[PDB]
Subunit: 131 residues, 4 copies
């Protein structure tokens, strides 16, 4: 009762293109085989897929995920550091987006009235939107 | 004013590496060259650099940015519609991040004590939160 | 005929996550709904989606894409100028990878017979590639 | 040897903003500071910077790079395994970019003589072309 590529895609909500990709870089290869070849993914493949999705969610790259998955347990300490790292990346990003939003809402209020703007003048203003 | 690539890089907080790329793809070519090949940047180039920086900030692709920087004036709507859209993009990102951070707290709470974290167990547990 | 978000994900080679996101940021919202209260996509939505996919294939940002579609038709001259730009961007990336790969094989072959790969040294030899 | 943040930025061909960020996420922190508060980067910090760049150049992520730079040396078998995986990612991109350029050459040829590009029509030709050469 293995799955066709298209079935697996629907099941794990991944595009077929993304599956061919993961299979290609050897991050997730379908486990089954009939005769005359043929793909076919299994229920164990789904867990690994879900595993991959769990770590992308946390911000890890295919490289790290590959490393992680190639193990049963990855020892807390080192792992928490890994995840805590991704956390700092997120926090830094959270602060960055907050500012960008503020800069744009600001720029809008400043230029809404203008039918046209000098591209340069509209940059110098956005630039002075830092100390 | 005149800037040798390295001095230009430094004054615009951009790498010498980036400048060579903007030059290659023709996004920002130096207005002048030394007589021995070395490139020389002008104050104008500095504004073009400032501009590339500004619009990249607004979410514009490098291709659209070029077109914009090649016109003195432009219909204000081009920027207005863009920031408006990016605003929604960034708001969805804030939510997406606030959630991920929240999920990490949970993850830390559940395996902070263990000697090892079972990848399969970890993933299924995290999946619970989706 | 129409589709529910799941069947639409299949028709248009995309995911439900993607579709929900597009719905949230108002880049693509379903043209209809079922009495049950579910998203129900039209053949028209399917085409808008195809358009989003295209263009995104080019270095176009979501925001730029919405503008492209709403415009219905765009000036060929400027458009092909942006695509030719992206072409240079892609050719630069293509040659960049070519370099990275050969650098990869050099280092790979050099540290091949060592017991351990000293990170600091590895980096040192790589750097010395000029 | 010692570097202030600007001197250090110029040396590793990295921006000041990038250095502040690395500092913020604990990827690369100044090992010494000035009595007035300014960061003082060391020769040791200089090696870590170059390692970060060397692996960035190879396409590794910052997280991956942190794991790497946190351990002096790695077991050759495993190292190569990791290099090989990354080498595949690069081959995938190389191949993908080749199709894109190709797709763009076709589309350019198609609307080259048209005053306007009809979005919906364009999208149909691009999709038919991508699939046609599947």
């Amino acid at each position: 009762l293995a799955w066709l590529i298209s079935e697996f895609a629907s099941v794990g909500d991944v595009t077929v293109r993304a599956l061919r990709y993961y299979d290609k870089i050897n991050l997730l290869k379908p486990s089954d085989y009939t005769e005359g070849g043929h793909r076919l993914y299994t229920k164990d493949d789904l867990y690994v897929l879900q595993q991959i999705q769990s770590f992308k969610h946390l911000g890890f790259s295919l490289g790290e995920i590959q490393n992680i998955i190639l193990q049963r347990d990855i020892e807390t300490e080192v792992f928490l550091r890994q995840m805590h790292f991704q956390r700092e990346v997120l926090l830094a990003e959270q602060e960055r987006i907050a500012k960008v939003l503020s800069h744009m809402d600001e720029m809008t209020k400043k230029f809404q009235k203008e039918e046209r703007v000098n591209v340069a003048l509209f940059s110098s203003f956005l630039q002075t939107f830092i100390w």
